[PDB]
Amino acid sequence: SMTDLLSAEDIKKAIGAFTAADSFDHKKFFQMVGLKKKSADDVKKVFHILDKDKSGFIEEDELGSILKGFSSDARDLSAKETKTLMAAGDKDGDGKIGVEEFSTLVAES
């Protein structure tokens, strides 16, 4: 889980409070979820949870799957988010998010 690091409450509200909004851009959700509340290391703690067999990074395509890790209560990465959230979080512009970019996504939102 990611409650000891990331604000457990935030993730609960941010995830279940935005059905369509976050559906467009989770960036804002990134703020409400409380991912910024901590540092890249803290947020990364979940990255190890979700990025278990992603070889260090998840692909925008599969990103919509791994999404449920946190979003299991909300929706997943759709066309909009793949291009919006993945392409954003992965500011480096690699179409994917790895241990390196997962820190950048914190600076994004």
The answer to whether 45 is a known ligand-binding residue is no
- Method by which the model was determined: NMR
What are the sequence ranges of the domains in the chain?
1-109
CA 38 from chain center: how many Å? 14
The answer to whether 90 is a known ligand-binding residue is yes
Query: HEC states along the chain?
Result: CCCCCCCHHHHHHHHHHCCCHHHHCHHHHHHHCCCCCCCHHHHHHHHHHHCCCCCCEEECCCHHHHCHHHHCCCCCCCHHHHHHHHHHHCCCCCCEEECCHHHHHHHHC
The answer to whether 92 is a known ligand-binding residue is yes
Quick check: 99 and 57 in contact, CB under 8 A?
yes
Closest of 108, 6, 15, 81 to residue 47, by C-alpha:
6
The answer to whether 76 is a known ligand-binding residue is no
CA 107 from chain center: how many Å? 12
> For residue 25, which phi and psi values (nearest 5 degrees)?
-145, 105
What CATH topology corresponds to 1-109? Answer: Recoverin; domain 1 (1.10.238)
Distance between CA atoms of residues 38 and 87, nearest Å: 22
